[PDB]
Amino acid sequence: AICSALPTIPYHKLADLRYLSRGASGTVSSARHADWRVQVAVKHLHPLLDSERKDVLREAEILHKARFSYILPILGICNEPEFLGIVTEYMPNGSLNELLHRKTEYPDVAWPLRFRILHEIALGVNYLHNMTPPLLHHDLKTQNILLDNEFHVKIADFGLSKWRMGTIIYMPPENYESIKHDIYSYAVITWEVLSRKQPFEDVTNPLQIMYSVSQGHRPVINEESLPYDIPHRARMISLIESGWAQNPDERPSFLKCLIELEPVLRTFEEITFLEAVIQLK
Amino acid sequence: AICSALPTIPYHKLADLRYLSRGAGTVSSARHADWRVQVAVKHLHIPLLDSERKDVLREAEILHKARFSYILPILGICNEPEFLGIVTEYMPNGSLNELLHRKTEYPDVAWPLRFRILHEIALGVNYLHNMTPPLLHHDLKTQNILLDNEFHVKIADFGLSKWRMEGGTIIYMPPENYEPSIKHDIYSYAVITWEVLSRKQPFEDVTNPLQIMYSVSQGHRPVINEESLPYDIPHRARMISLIESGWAQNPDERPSFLKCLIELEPVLRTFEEITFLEAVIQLK
Ligand SMILES: CC(C)(C)S(=O)(=O)c1cc2c(Nc3ccc4scnc4c3)ncnc2cc1OCCOP(=O)(O)O
Ligand SMILES: CC(C)(C)S(=O)(=O)c1cc2c(Nc3ccc4scnc4c3)ncnc2cc1OCCOP(=O)(O)O
Numbered sequence: 372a373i374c375s376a377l378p379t380i381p382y383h384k385l386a387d388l389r390y391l392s393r394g395a396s397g398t399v400s401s402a403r404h405a406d407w408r409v410q411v412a413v414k415h416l417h418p419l420l421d422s423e424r425k426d427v428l429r430e431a432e433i434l435h436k437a438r439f440s441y442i443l444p445i446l447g448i449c450n451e452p453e454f455l456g457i458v459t460e461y462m463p464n465g466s467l468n469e470l471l472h473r474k475t476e477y478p479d480v481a482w483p484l485r486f487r488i489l490h491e492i493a494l495g496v497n498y499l500h501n502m503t504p505p506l507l508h509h510d511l512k513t514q515n516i517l518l519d520n521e522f523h524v525k526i527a528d529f530g531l532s533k534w535r536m537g538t539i540i541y542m543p544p545e546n547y548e549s550i551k552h553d554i555y556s557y558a559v560i561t562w563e564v565l566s567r568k569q570p571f572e573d574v575t576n577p578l579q580i581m582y583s584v585s586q587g588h589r590p591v592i593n594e595e596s597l598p599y600d601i602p603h604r605a606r607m608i609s610l611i612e613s614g615w616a617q618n619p620d621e622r623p624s625f626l627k628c629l630i631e632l633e634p635v636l637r638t639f640e641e642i643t644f645l646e647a648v649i650q651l652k
Numbered sequence: 653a654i655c656s657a658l659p660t661i662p663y664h665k666l667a668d669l670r671y672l673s674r675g676a677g678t679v680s681s682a683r684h685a686d687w688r689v690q691v692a693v694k695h696l697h698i699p700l701l702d703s704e705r706k707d708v709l710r711e712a713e714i715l716h717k718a719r720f721s722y723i724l725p726i727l728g729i730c731n732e733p734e735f736l737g738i739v740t741e742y743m744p745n746g747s748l749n750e751l752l753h754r755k756t757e758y759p760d761v762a763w764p765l766r767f768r769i770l771h772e773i774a775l776g777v778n779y780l781h782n783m784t785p786p787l788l789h790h791d792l793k794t795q796n797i798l799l800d801n802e803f804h805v806k807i808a809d810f811g812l813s814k815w816r817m818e819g820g821t822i823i824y825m826p827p828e829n830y831e832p833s834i835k836h837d838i839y840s841y842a843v844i845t846w847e848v849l850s851r852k853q854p855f856e857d858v859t860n861p862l863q864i865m866y867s868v869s870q871g872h873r874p875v876i877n878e879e880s881l882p883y884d885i886p887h888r889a890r891m892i893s894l895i896e897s898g899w900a901q902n903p904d905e906r907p908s909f910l911k912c913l914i915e916l917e918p919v920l921r922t923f924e925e926i927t928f929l930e931a932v933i934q935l936k
């Protein structure tokens with residue numbers, strides 16, 4: 372019956388508070404804890420509403436309960452009449468979205484690192500699904516896979532997460548009008564990691580995406596999207612195709628997904644991961 | 653308020669249970685059958701005394717409560733009539749002790765990494781001291797500073813730790829702790845700093861540890877000279893000053909970890925980011 376309380380952080384302890392980004396989830400700022408002498412990230416509201424207050428506390432409780440090696444570590448809650456935010460560790464290398472799509476900043480993203488990121492996303496989500504009761508993330512995207520100083524994964528944005536009791540490109544078609552949601556989002560992420568392409572890039576209207584996916588269309592699998600030189604290409608296409616299956620029942624569990632990925636990750640020597648990171652800006 | 657429960661891990665979920673080391677308990681590596689991750693298990697030497705049981709659950713609770721970036725992350729408690737242990741993340745690069753003293757395996761341990769390790773030990777301990785009530789480690793040693801895949805620090809062994817409200821080595825113990833304090837950890841930290849910068853065993857020339865205690869109680873400390881600490885150590889003067897104030901005979905004259913961090917922050921900024929990655933690739 373061992374319990375841990377989430378610390379409360381007085382707002383005045385957050386020095387050098389500097390805006391990072393703004394989204395549907397909230398505003399993100401970087402700061403430094405005055406006493407802990409560490410860099411932190413604060414996901415705050417930035418006009419006060421008590422409905423938004425309950426949302427932030429809900430997210431903070433989920434993150435506190437869901438602590439694991441591949442989940443964004445929550446450091447405390449900053450709860451004041453003036454300000455409200457979730458204080459977490461600062462991820463110096465940002466998101467998987469930027470790593471994949473900022474091609475001038477990152478001309479090369481070595482295969483070992485790409486596969487390690489995919490393994491760690493699967494490890495993080497599997498942990499969530501294995502909790503009592505299971506936690507389902509329900510908003511996985513390359514924007515929510517944060518990367519620490521050594522490009523290790525930290526899953527963020529627990530705003531839509533649910534206890535099993537914006538963009539639509541990662542959403543399973545049955546969700547337009549389930550434990551099998553996250554695996555679908557994961558198959559799209561996998562495709563995106565291996566291609567460095569935006570899913571449905573040639574599609575201008577998101578209603579056209581939604582209609583196509585509802586009819587069984589998926590991001591294109593060919594020589595141009597997934598080149599023949601991808602290590603374990605056949606096996607990876609198989610995983611992607613089972614993950615984004617039209618029938619949710621036919622999509623694998625993250626356990627099955629990990630049992631498949633484990634022999635692939637063992638083909639890479641340990642030093643090749645370190646070498647991949649040192650190559651990166 | 654927001655509370656988190658420490659998961660309970662059935663023993664049968666720990667596959668490939670292999671012995672790592674034994675000490676004042678036993679540490680084994682395993683893999684979680686459902687989580688598909690490598691874990692470390694600090695368990696009792698396989699007889700189950702109810703006094704030893706309370707000790708494990710006490711440490712498990714301290715580790716759960718003390719979660720931070722530089723503290724060994726607890727994953728769960730394995731509590732069964734058959735077996736009892738603390739399940740944590742596996743630290744693939746072992747301890748600071750091995751890094752420093754396994755000189756054939758590691759001929760060079762670059763200065764940036766050494767300073768980063770010292771910064772992270774100070775960050776970890778400072779966090780403990782800043783809790784309400786403060787947590788005091790009371791058993792810091794190079795054997796208890798574990799190193800992850802990229803040689804980032806994780807402080808372990810909370811067995812002697814306390815809330816400010818048989819064993820081994822005494823070389824990190826302040827002389828006032830000998831016979832029957834918030835200033836204990838800073839003393840252990842000064843010895844660790846000396847050890848990191850020298851790659852030498854404190855009081856190497858002294859065969860008997862009781863002779864060490866007699867020496868320390870008299871005001872003797874590990875030697876500070878050209879041979880122990882060469883003149884080519886980056887920020888040598890500043891570091892000697894930190895070490896000497898940290899292990900002072902008078903506890904009142906020892907700095908807080910905050911003061912220690914405020915001093916170390918400008919030193920760590922002198923090193924370029926790539927030098928930390930380079931230091932780690934050299935060690936592989
Ligand atoms: C995602 C991004 C790269 C556009 S960012 O917003 O600039 C960013 C976000 C961070 C974060 N976000 C967070 C914090 C708390 C919670 S509670 C649930 N979900 C969250 C998410 N957390 C940690 N570190 C972050 C770092 C970020 O960017 C890195 C800085 O980029 P740069 O200025 O280019 O060096
Ligand atoms: C310290 C060592 C290197 C001699 S080790 O014993 O081989 C070791 C220990 C680990 C650990 N210890 C632990 C576990 C749980 C608790 S609860 C409070 N304190 C602790 C401390 N935890 C995590 N990883 C460890 C890794 C260790 O070995 C390094 C790798 O050795 P090898 O497999 O031979 O390469």
Ligand SMILES: [Ca+2]
Nearest residue numbers: 757758759935
């Ligand atoms: Ca070597």
